[PDB]
Amino acid sequence: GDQAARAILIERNLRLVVYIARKFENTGINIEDLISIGTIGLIKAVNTFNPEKKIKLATYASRCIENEILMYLRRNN
Amino acid sequence: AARAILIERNLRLVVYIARKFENTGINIEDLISIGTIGLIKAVNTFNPEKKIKLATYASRCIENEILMYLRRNN
Amino acid sequence: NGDQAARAILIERNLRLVVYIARKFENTGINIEDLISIGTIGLIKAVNTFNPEKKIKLATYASRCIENEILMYLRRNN
Amino acid sequence: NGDQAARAILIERNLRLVVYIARKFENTGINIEDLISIGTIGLIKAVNTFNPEKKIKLATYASRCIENEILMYLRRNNKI
Amino acid sequence: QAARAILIERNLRLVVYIARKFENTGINIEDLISIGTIGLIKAVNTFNPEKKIKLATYASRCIENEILMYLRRNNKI
Amino acid sequence: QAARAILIERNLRLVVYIARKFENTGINIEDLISIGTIGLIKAVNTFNPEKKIKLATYASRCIENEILMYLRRNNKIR
């Protein structure tokens, strides 16, 4: 029910995870870790997104994906 | 924490399972993302008293998530 | 129930959706007749559980439920 | 009641629907007068349960309720 | 009640007998039967299984009243 | 544990067999399969095994009834 609704929104924004993950890729930071971590942020975005406000999902998701990655990068120096 | 330890410690498992689907021609980046969803489902639904190890249960959930995604779109 | 009369209207209005989706799974050598039946079950579940004041259209939600029912049928029989 | 006035407006607005649907079911052994009354009960139920927040016309919804009352009446009286 | 349905269905003829006495207007008998049936439903929903007035007489009044109010609302009787 | 899908899957060809009976009705078979399936769903949800009637017997009655109601409602020859 609610699960299927979130799956639709998650799967439509997967490329957004990759796009942001590639920005943070460089020496020592493996892209495959960043895709996973970023995907976690996308899941958090879809679960907390409020469609009754004027921020589009892709913009709110971008913020959550970045945030998840930055906190991973700070946790692992 | 706790759950976040289990997830971060098994990110490589997603890559290992996703590479099994190389011959589908589907972008490995998308499979990894899809498989990560499977890994997060496995952690959220484990129950350690069922006598099944978390790595094997997660292997199933990761492979299954990818399989459903591939058949849903083929 | 008046709710069931409304659900019946939206199910019958969208039987074509079951066919359009069922026909995509024809390469998985299962009879189209079975796929329509299984897909219809997913349409019934969609209309029964759809939340109209959420932001997902009925056709989008029902396509997901029709797919999910077929995919569960394919995984049970493989 | 204000809500009674609103329901009255909607019932009277769709009485043509009762007659048209009843005429479709008129047959030998089935009195049109009975079908109009039975159909009118279906219309009353439609207006009392209709939800405008959904995406179904009242007329679409009413006609379904009208048909359903007439069908159950014919099944109940063994006129299938 | 489930017994409401029985009371209504076997008083359907009552609606016709009353509605037929108003077909000296310019309103179709079909609409009068529909309106009278509203009067019958109102009577059954507001009937007391007692008192010195019982179903048939109370239903006749409500059926006639609804038809009268429908015709007066459209400026006939 | 609650998987009643064994019952439903076992009666799918019953839907097609009944829907083929209306070959002479000008309704596409795809619609009749869906409508019949609705009938099978109602059968399994209201089947009483304590009564003396087999499920496939009761299921056929609801499958055919669902189709007949759909055809009457749409003014099609039965």
Numbering used by the authors:
A (entry chain B): -2 to 74
B (entry chain C): 1 to 74
C (entry chain D): -3 to 74
D (entry chain A): -3 to 76
E (entry chain F): 0 to 76
F (entry chain E): 0 to 77
Please share excerpts from the published article on this structure.
In B. subtilis there are four sigma factors known to control sporulation—the process in which the bacteria become long-lived dormant spores to survive stress conditions.
Here we present an experimentally solved X-ray crystal structure of SigE residues 17–133 and review all of the available experimentally-solved and AlphaFold-predicted B. subtilis sigma factor structures. Initially we produced almost full-length B. subtilis SigE (residues 17–239, only missing the initial prosequence that maintains SigE in an inactive state before processing), but we found that it degraded to a smaller domain that remained stable over time, as observed by SDS-PAGE and 2D NMR. The first 27 residues of SigE are a pro-sequence that keeps the protein in the inactive state and ensures its localization to the mother cell. Crystals grew over a period of 4–6 months and the protein likely lost some N-terminal amino acids during this process. The structure is a classic four helix-turn-helix core found in all sigma factor σ2 domains and covers regions σ2.1 (55–78), σ2.2 (79–97), and σ2.3 (98–117) of SigE, which includes the binding sites for both CsfB and the −10 promoter DNA sequence for transcriptional activation. The solved structure aligns very well (RMSD: 0.51 Å) with the AlphaFold prediction for SigE, with Alphafold providing a slight helix overprediction in the loop between two helices.
